[PDB]
Ligand binder design. Structure first.
Ligand SMILES: *[C@@H]1O[C@H](CO)[C@@H](O[C@@H]2O[C@H](CO)[C@@H](O)[C@H](O)[C@H]2NC(C)=O)[C@H](O)[C@H]1NC(C)=O
Ligand SMILES: *[C@@H]1O[C@H](CO)[C@@H](O[C@@H]2O[C@H](CO)[C@@H](O)[C@H](O)[C@H]2NC(C)=O)[C@H](O)[C@H]1NC(C)=O
Lengths: 112, 199, 112, 199
């Protein structure tokens, strides 16, 4: 029973605001203070539909699970597209510098 | 592969950049007490670069995309740099099935080459950018690629950044939460300094 | 307790031969008879190392889970690269035709 | 998005194709009883295409990659097709900063164009392929792109398939497990029929 409630709800995108102070990163990152990052969670069980954005492999694996669950897990709800944010932070030489951080924001989810 | 434990997300050097999404709590903003050009100018010192930085941008007054396209085309007619090797090393030589004594003609050599050059050169357009109150100077001159056409024959490729340089400017940093204990510190702000034709 | 044994073992690639007769696809696909498909399974817990092939987002989410597990799940072990196989099968007009099926074979795994 | 329930993996039309990874149990193979050209030829009937299919390939005897490169270059000197519009519509006209009365010269027009053409044309090379005993005819003539150089200026782009056609051939199909109940049926086997310069 130790888990989030994620059985009958299907693979989907959820909100998640991440504050850098809460992760102890305020002396590494000076701006922004946090970002809307989102996350994916939910089920990928048979049958999958087109909205689940599944790879062909995830479709094969889902059918293989249905049929003997011990042979393979079901695929997971993971991000299919992410975006970058820009961040101002101290680097290895303790210089502050602005750069792009890729793949930080979830834009969409899928069965993988 | 650089750092063994990946417990922070790594930074990347891809340009260009979206600017900080800044939070509007007014505690973070610097107030007029140390918003005085003179100490600002001395603290930044030699970082000061008036061709790239300003309290008040030339780009002002006393559709405009067709203008971008016309600027771009003009700039491509006087490409800077040296002719690239890949073009300079082009003798339109082998023609009659991988050659003739001369498929084209000397003259036509260089002219075809200059045309290849202007067609595939990718200029950096510049524009003034408002970084907001937390930076100083607040306005900085930022580079960009023109990517509303293709820079290859045949069509497919598009101009993208290929080199970058950094401006040094100042940031209003608040140590404690709520913006207690603020101050200005040098920060490196990147700008595109070259563009190149790319897939 | 209802699950595979996938706690202390880290995110990794595993073998899985899939036979099309076993999925009831022998009257749709006439060749091959099956393929080595593999699958991913394992943990993505903090800390992740470079071998986990994590996105920046998966690193942020892992740190967010460590720190309050109820706020977000941990990222999942999913394929990072797949390959195609070619398959001979009856199509919608009941014509048999040979084509590529992309993303059918797992080549590598990662934290997503 | 075509099918609502995605309970099978969908097929794709990307070329080119790896050939079937075939299983070597000998039950699946057809035996000499109905491996007789005459009924084979009549059953396939008009599908038969001797420019593309065979029991025994020309490609035989009575390093060889430098040869591919030389073939490719020759084939590019006599491109088939019509000159592509994008090239035909090229007047090397605007030169002195987006023009002159004529930056280049008429002559040099067409010649620059033919050079652009040969430089960016992508021929299909052909080669005989052994499909194995489960198909008949067993040898089929298959198309391909030459992709060991770039077909663009500047360099980046590579030749890739852009059209395809299908050969109809026959397959030795076993219904039941263990290859009980076998037979030959028409199957569509795809081959590359055009290539194009692409990122
Ligand atoms: C499957 O992909 C789709 C889009 O490719 C996701 O759909 C969109 O994302 C937002 C969520 O903020 C929707 O309001 C948009 O309308 C959708 N747009 C399109 C293109 O249809 C969806 O997230 C993906 N499925 C899952 C499970 O996340
Ligand atoms: C992380 O990525 C790596 C490679 O990018 C995976 O590593 C390889 O795959 C095979 C497994 O059959 C190894 O024997 C290869 O040597 C590895 N090659 C390289 C490039 O180092 C690995 O699967 C990925 N990590 C996970 C969790 O799967």
């Amino acid at each position: 029973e130790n888990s989030s409630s994620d059985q009958r709800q299907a693979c989907k995108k959820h909100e998640l605001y991440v504050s850098f102070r809460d992760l102890g990163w305020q002396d590494w990152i000076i701006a922004p203070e946090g970002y809307a990052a989102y996350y994916c969670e939910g089920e990928c069980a048979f049958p999958l539909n087109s909205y689940m954005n599944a790879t062909n492999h995830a479709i094969v694996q889902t059918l293989v699970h249905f049929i003997n669950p011990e042979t393979v897990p079901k695929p997971c709800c993971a991000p299919t597209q992410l975006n970058a944010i820009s961040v101002l932070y101290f680097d290895d030489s303790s210089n502050v510098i602005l750069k792009k951080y890729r793949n930080m924001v979830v834009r969409a989810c899928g069965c993988h | 592969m650089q750092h063994y434990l990946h417990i922070r997300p790594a930074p990347s050097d891809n340009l260009p950049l979206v600017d900080l999404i800044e939070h509007p709590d007014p505690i973070f903003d610097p107030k007029e007490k140390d918003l005085n050009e003179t100490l600002l100018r001395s603290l930044l010192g030699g970082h000061y670069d008036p061709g790239f930085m300003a309290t008040s941008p030339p780009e002002d007054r006393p559709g405009g995309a067709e203008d971008l396209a016309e600027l771009d085309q003009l700039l491509r007619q006087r490409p800077s740099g040296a002719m690239p090797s890949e073009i300079k090393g082009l003798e339109f030589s082998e023609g009659l099935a991988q050659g003739k004594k001369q498929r084209l003609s000397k003259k036509l050599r260089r002219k075809l080459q200059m045309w290849l050059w202007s067609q595939t050169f990718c200029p950096v357009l510049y524009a003034w950018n408002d970084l907001g109150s937390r930076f100083w100077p607040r306005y900085v001159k930022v580079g960009s690629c023109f990517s509303k056409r293709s820079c290859s024959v045949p069509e497919g490729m598009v101009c993208k950044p290929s080199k970058s340089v950094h401006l040094t400017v100042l940031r209003w940093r608040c140590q404690r939460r709520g913006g207690q204990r603020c101050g200005w510190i040098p920060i490196q702000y990147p700008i595109i300094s070259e563009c190149k034709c790319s897939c």
